Design a binder for these strands. Sequence first.
RNA 1: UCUACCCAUGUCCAGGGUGAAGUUCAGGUAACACUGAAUGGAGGCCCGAACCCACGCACGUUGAAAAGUGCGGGGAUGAGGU
RNA 2: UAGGCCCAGGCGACUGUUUAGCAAAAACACAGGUCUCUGCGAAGCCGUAAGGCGAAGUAUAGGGGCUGACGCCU
Lengths: 267, 246, 44, 214
Amino acid sequence: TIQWFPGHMAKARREVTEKLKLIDIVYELVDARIPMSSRNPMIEDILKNKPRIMLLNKADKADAAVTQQWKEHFENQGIRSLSINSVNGQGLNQIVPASKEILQEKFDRMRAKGVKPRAIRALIIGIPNVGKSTLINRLAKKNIAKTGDRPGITTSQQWVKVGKELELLDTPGILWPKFEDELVGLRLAVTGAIKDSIINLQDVAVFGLRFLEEHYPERLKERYGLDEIPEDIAELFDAIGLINYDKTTEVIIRDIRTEKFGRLSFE
Amino acid sequence: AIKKYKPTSNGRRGMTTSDFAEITTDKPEKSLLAPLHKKGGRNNQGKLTVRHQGGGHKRQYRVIDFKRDKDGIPGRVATVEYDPNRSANIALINYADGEKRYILAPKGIQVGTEIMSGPEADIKVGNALPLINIPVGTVVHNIELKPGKGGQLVRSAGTSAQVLGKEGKYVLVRLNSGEVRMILSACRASIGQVGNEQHELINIGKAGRSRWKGIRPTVRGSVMNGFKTRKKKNKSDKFIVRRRKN
Amino acid sequence: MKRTFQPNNRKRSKVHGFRSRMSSKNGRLVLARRRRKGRKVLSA
Amino acid sequence: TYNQQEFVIVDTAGMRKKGKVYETTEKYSVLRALKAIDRSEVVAVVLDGEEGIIEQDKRIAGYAHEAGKAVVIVVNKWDAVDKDESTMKEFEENIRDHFQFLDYAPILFMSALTKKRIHTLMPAIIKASENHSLRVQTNVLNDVIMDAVAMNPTPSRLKIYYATQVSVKPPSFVVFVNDPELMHFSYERFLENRIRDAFGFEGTPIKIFARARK
RNA sequence: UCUACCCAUGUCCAGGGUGAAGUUCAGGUAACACUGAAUGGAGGCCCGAACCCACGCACGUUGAAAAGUGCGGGGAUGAGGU
RNA sequence: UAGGCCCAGGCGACUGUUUAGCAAAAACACAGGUCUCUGCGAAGCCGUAAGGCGAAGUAUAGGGGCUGACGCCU
Ligand SMILES: Nc1nc2c(ncn2[C@@H]2O[C@H](COP(=O)(O)OP(=O)(O)NP(=O)(O)O)[C@@H](O)[C@H]2O)c(=O)[nH]1
């Protein structure tokens, strides 16, 4: 099925564990379209006795109501959460005050201990192909990290000193060694975060089509210059044209990630 | 005025050229020509002193007349021609006496105009007069510095100066670069502003056009692994009324 | 590949010739030294 | 006595260049001026505002710094040059560019002729008095050391084992290492900046000593 | 007299493509800019021999040669080669 | 004897130039932008000086720095 787990992912866990002490605060990036399935229990087990905040990046592509409901669900769960758009600063201004409020206890303890306040050390962690580096570049305004439109761009963790106020640690995305629930794997593959040359694209397209038919029948109706909802997939595939028998699957997955359709969420 | 090329190639994107709407001939006059070879920024020792120079199309010098001094003898403009040495255009004058000359072409010269230089000449474009005779408020060019020489100042393309005061034995003039200074009253100047005023809007558009014009590549000093320089006891400082502080 | 020596009679006489040596003082010193040693051929 | 506190002030007749001081034993007074620094514990260096930074001024400030004494850089005669916005930063920035070796020294502006901001000199002095004689806790000082070396794990490899303070004035510190030869002047300066940032330590020099594994 | 840059005078580039400005007729109009048609031959334009380079592989390394050979490759009317 | 073709990300706008003989590139240059000096025996340079380049040119013109097409933010 989906098994992608190279060696740099394995080394990332060891490096994070070996450099855990210096960390003051943790930011855990989670995609808004799939807030529950995008969490990583494997890295969460390592991460404990540390305050953290949930971040919902790529929030422009998801439905506002479901994202806000998920924000409430995280908030009353017992963890702080926020909705952010990395490409254009939407909620980026309200994270430094949150970090200050969270760490104020240790800050005042140290201040009364007799030392000058120092910079906040933050570690950014999450699954690949989420705004782990674009957010850093926006926060530093410098364009210092390398970004790309495919998973697996960065390969080594790096320190970034944002002024005299923040010390950020970046990290390559991490995936659990073995999947358990196939629906989560399908959703992850749809959203990206996988090399896409290791998986079966036809099953991804089938899942997308059936989810669309179940949830957004009107958006499926408008589609791209065709209006039908038959039982099979071959009706829509041969819209615009030997023609590609099923390579059009890529087309089906090509536009959706670019939001040719309207905003949607899978939850 | 300005012609824009269509982007038929990568090297023609944004390239603009002149129009040559004020040219009536394509051949110069054999009499007013002289050889002119190219130097590469070298000198009498052969060593290089000025960088970023050398190469380019061959040229031939045209003998302009910056001194005038041909009083009386009214002249008629015969043609306006293109000159490669300067940034302006030149005009050929067939003086009624018989001798032909070349002068700088002020803006607004039409073929057939009658020009005249001297103390009794009237105030119109193309005439030349001593600074004493011209009244306040006029726009002049081809300013002289000391009597007997020829047109040192304000003779590039689309540049003009102005007369302000008539203090005794001198004249107050403001130059192109906001300078204000006094000039000896016996010097000469020509009425009008130099033509070809749109010369500064031309886009070169390509790396080879500047090579044609004779400019060599410039290498930044970084990869080469506001102090005023005017003399502090220089003469002619008593003549500078208002400095060029811009 | 072009080797460094490409013979030419005019340039040889213009640079290493007798009159070129006699034009300046150092050339005259060279001629004097070669006369002192006794070389059969001098200048070029 | 100032603000119910007593004070002692000494003048030193100025100092000129060593090369051109070939006087008739009248420069014998300079030895007297040098003596006062040894008996003083706060040094005020004075520069003219009308004139730019002269090379001799940097040399004079060297003697105070090498003596381990608190320094407060002072400039006089603002009545000559213009007083305007961004004329504050013209000399404020220029001093930092040229006077790099001393950065802890606060910068004060006052003109004695017009008596502008003269009363502000002592507030600088009293603050500098404390920092030249201060001790930090041994527990706290050690806890800051390995935080610095962790984010900069580029010291075979030099090893840091211990750190503590010896003197009050100036604050001397000794670090026990496997070998002091591995210590690099670039890295030694790096430790000073972290200490100078962990606490105030403003307006006073600091010296770091290194001891072997023992 | 090799190589770097400059100065004055000569000389070389088989063939085939694409079709800018301008001009003429002209739907459009009251005429345009815009349709099309015809003419026109611009370009550090395209494919590619002579010529000039030197990206890949193999051989040779007491070599035919103290920087070459064989098969592919880049530029080829120009900031060109000689 | 005569072109293999199609998708997706970086980098550099393009044509060109570089370590003869290990590195042809993302490195250099480039068209455009911007800062600063210069009123003419100009400012800068080469020369001990005479003598020259800049230029027989004059602020829409020349030296010296920093960036580097053109559309949307600084
Ligand atoms: N629309 C949208 N795109 C976003 C957002 N954040 C990031 N992206 C897109 O995500 C890509 C860059 O993601 P990136 O942060 O580099 O992912 P990554 O987790 O760092 N991958 P890796 O760790 O392997 O380097 C770009 O295509 C960028 O446009 C967002 O909030 N909205």
